Structure formats: structure tokens, C-alpha cells
Structure 1
Amino acid sequence: GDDRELAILATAENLLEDRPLADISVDDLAKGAGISRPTFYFYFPSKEAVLLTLLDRVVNQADMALQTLAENPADTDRENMWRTGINVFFETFGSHKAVTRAGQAARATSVEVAELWSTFMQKWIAYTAAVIDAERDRGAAPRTLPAHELATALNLMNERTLFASFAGEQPSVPEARVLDTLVHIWVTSIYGE
């Protein structure tokens, strides 16, 4: 019943390691999930709706991990705080590289994917901005750029850079270096200046 939907999801994720969404067929997904093609369609309209659900669970998982951080303040310096937050995305998407990579490419192609990505990027920008402002009210950060324009560019940086790394793009920051790199840039641009 439910367990089948989960099987279609797990099959899709497993096949996206080895190839793109284009070379995955509804029949491939049905086979893998141990159901037939017409049973597949009872659970999802398309292969693309499978991706969307997948991306949706990943992004929500990152989002939830970030709320947990926000509610339970990790006790530390400014540098470590920021690193902990960037680490949420680096870990969460880095554990779901095929879904990430495919979810990025379907932004060009799927309006729902584009808008889901958009909703969350906005949510995460807003929270980064809310935290930069909080940091400024306290006197820890100088009032340089508008907080929200700063948050925007720094979050756009992480998206490009994190996914470039994960995909192994030329050029990219090696994955083992990406986190320190992004953090140096967040911390100097937020506190400097």
C-alpha cells in the first residue's frame, strides 16, 4: 500500500546514481519496485513526479535539520555556529547527490521543481538574514550590506559551489575542502569591513 510508493522512491534514487532521469523509464521504476507499469501510475503521474517527491523529502529533511539547529543553540563561537548551519546542507545534500543533481537539472524543465527550490531558497535566505540582523543588534556584526542582499548572494554561492563539488564539476572546490571554503567566506563577509 504505502510500502510500494516507498519502493518506487527507493528504486528511482538508486537508478539516478547510475544514469539521468531521461534514461530512466517508468517501466524501469515499476520493475525495480516489483509492481507493474499501470500500478506505478496509481502512485505517481510521471517519472518526473517521482523526482519531485524525492527532492521534496531531501529539501524538507535539510529544512528540518536547520530548524533543530535554530531552536537548540549550539554553544560556540560565531565561526562554528555558521559552519554547523552550512554543514546541514553539505551533509543532507551530500548524502543525496543523485537526487540533488537531478533536482537541480529539472529546475529548467519542471515548474513545480523550480518553485519548490524557490520556496526553500527564500526560507533559508530569510533565516540567514534574520540571523545576520540579530548578530548586528548585538554589536557582533557591522552594519555593512543590507542583510538580506548579503544572505541572498552567500546562499547563491553555497548552492552553486556545494552542487558543483558533489557533481565533480570542472571547475569546483574539492568536496573535502568545500565546507571550510564557504565558511571562511561567510564569516569574513558577515563580520568584516
Structure 2
Amino acid sequence: GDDRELAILATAENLLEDRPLADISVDDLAKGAGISRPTFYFYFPSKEAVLLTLLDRVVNQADMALQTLAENPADTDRENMWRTGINVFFETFGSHKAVTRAGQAARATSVEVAELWSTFMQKWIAYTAAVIDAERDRGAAPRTLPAHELATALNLMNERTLFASFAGEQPSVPEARVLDTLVHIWVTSIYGE
């Protein structure tokens, strides 16, 4: 039951490491999961729906990890606070590069993948903005740009820059330098006047 479903998900994630969704068949997913094609269709309406679930799981893992941080402050300076938080996204999505890559491409063709991504981006921006506001309220950050607009650009930066590094795009920041690059831009743009 949940075991066949999990096997289909594992197969799909494994197969997306070697080729795109377009080059993967339902027969490929069924075969890999040790089930027939009609049995597959009992668990999922389409290969597209398999990706959506994989992405949903990755996105929620990141979100849950950020919630955990938000509830248990690490005892460090402000630079390290931002780094720790950006690192949740670096590690979570960096641990699922094929799902990241396929899921970002699916945004063009799938309304549900677009809305999933859009919902969580709004959440992570809102949280970023709340932290900047608290930093301004405590007098640690200067009142420069509208917090929510600053939050939006920094989050979009992270999205495009992390994804380019993971995919090895040209151009991209090397994966071993991307965390420090983002953290510097967040800290200088948040604290700087």
C-alpha cells in the first residue's frame, strides 16, 4: 500500500538522476516499483503526479526544518543566524538535486507545481520579512528598503542561485562557495546603510 507508493516515489527519484521526466515512462516507474502499469494508476494518476508528490515532500521537509530553527534559536551572531537558515535550503534541496531540477522545470507546464512553489515562496518571504522587521524593531538593522520587497529579492536570488549551482549551469557560483556568497549578500543588504 504505502509501500508500493513509496517504491514508486523512490524509483521516480532514482530515475530522475539519469534522465528527465519526459524520458521516463509509467511502465518504467511500474517496472522499477515491482508492479504492473494498472496497479501504478491506482496509486497515481500520472508520472506528473509522482513528481508533484516528490516535490511536495522536499518542500515540506525544508519548511519543517526552518520551523524547527525558528522555534529553537542557535546562540550566535546575526551572520551565523542567517547562514543557519539559508543552510536549511542548501542542504535539503542539495540532497534532492534531481527532484529539484525536474520540479523547477515542471513549473512551466504544471499549474499545481507552480502553485505549490508559489505558496511556499510566499511563506518563506513572509518569514524573512518578519525577521528583518524584528531586527529593525530591536535596532540591530536600519530602516532602508520595505522589508517585504527586500525579502522578496533575496529569496528570489537564493532560488535562482542555489538552483544554478546544483544544476552546474554556466554561469553559476561553485556549490562549495554558494552558501558564503548568499550569506554575505543577505547580511550586507539587511544590516547595511
TM-score bucket (shorter structure)? over 0.9
Q: Distance in 2 between matches of 1:15 and 1:165?
A: 21
Shift of 1:94: 0.1
Shift of 1:166: 0.1
Provide Cα deviations, 1:114-169, integer angstroms capped at 9, x if missing partner: 00000000000000000000000000000000000000000000000000000000
Give the equivalent residue in structure 2 for 1:43: 43
Q: Distance in 2 between matches of 1:29 and 1:39?
A: 11
Secondary structure of the residue aligned to 1:144 is coil
Matched, 1:133 2:127: no
Q: Distance in 1 between matches of 2:178 and 2:144?
A: 25
Secondary structure of the residue aligned to 1:136 is helix
Secondary structure of the residue aligned to 1:18 is coil
Shift of 1:2: 1.0
Q: Distance in 1 between matches of 2:175 and 2:25?
A: 31
Matched, 1:192 2:185: no
Say how many residue pairs are matched. Answer: 193
Give the equivalent residue in structure 2 for 1:113: 113
Structure 1, gaps ≥5 residues long: none
Identity %: 100
Q: Distance in 1 between matches of 2:80 and 2:165?
A: 22
Q: Distance in 2 between matches of 1:91 and 1:150?
A: 23
Shift of 1:71: 0.2
The TM-score, its normalising length taken from structure 1, stands at: 1.00
Provide Cα deviations, 1:82-128, integer angstroms capped at 9, x if missing partner: 00000000000000000000000000000000000000000000000
Provide Cα deviations, 1:159-186, integer angstroms capped at 9, x if missing partner: 0000000000000000000000000000
Shift of 1:54: 0.2
Q: Segments of 4+ in structure 1 off by > 3 A?
A: none
Q: Distance in 2 between matches of 1:17 and 1:162?
A: 18
Q: Distance in 2 between matches of 1:151 and 1:37?
A: 45
Provide Cα deviations, 1:36-55, integer angstroms capped at 9, x if missing partner: 00000000000000000000
Provide Cα deviations, 1:2-43, integer angstroms capped at 9, x if missing partner: 100000000000000000000000000000000000000000
Secondary structure of the residue aligned to 2:45 is coil
Q: Distance in 1 between matches of 2:161 and 2:189?
A: 17
Q: CA RMSD in A?
A: 0.2
Shift of 1:76: 0.3
- The correspondence of residues 133-172 of structure 1 with structure 2, limited to 5 A, is 133-172=133-172
Q: Distance in 2 between matches of 1:134 and 1:111?
A: 34
- The correspondence of residues 1-193 of structure 1 with structure 2, limited to 5 A, is 1-193=1-193
Q: Distance in 1 between matches of 2:120 and 2:27?
A: 32
The TM-score, its normalising length taken from structure 2, stands at: 1.00
Q: Distance in 1 between matches of 2:24 and 2:158?
A: 29
Q: Distance in 1 between matches of 2:131 and 2:119?
A: 19
Q: Distance in 2 between matches of 1:119 and 1:96?
A: 20
Structure 2, gaps ≥5 residues long: none
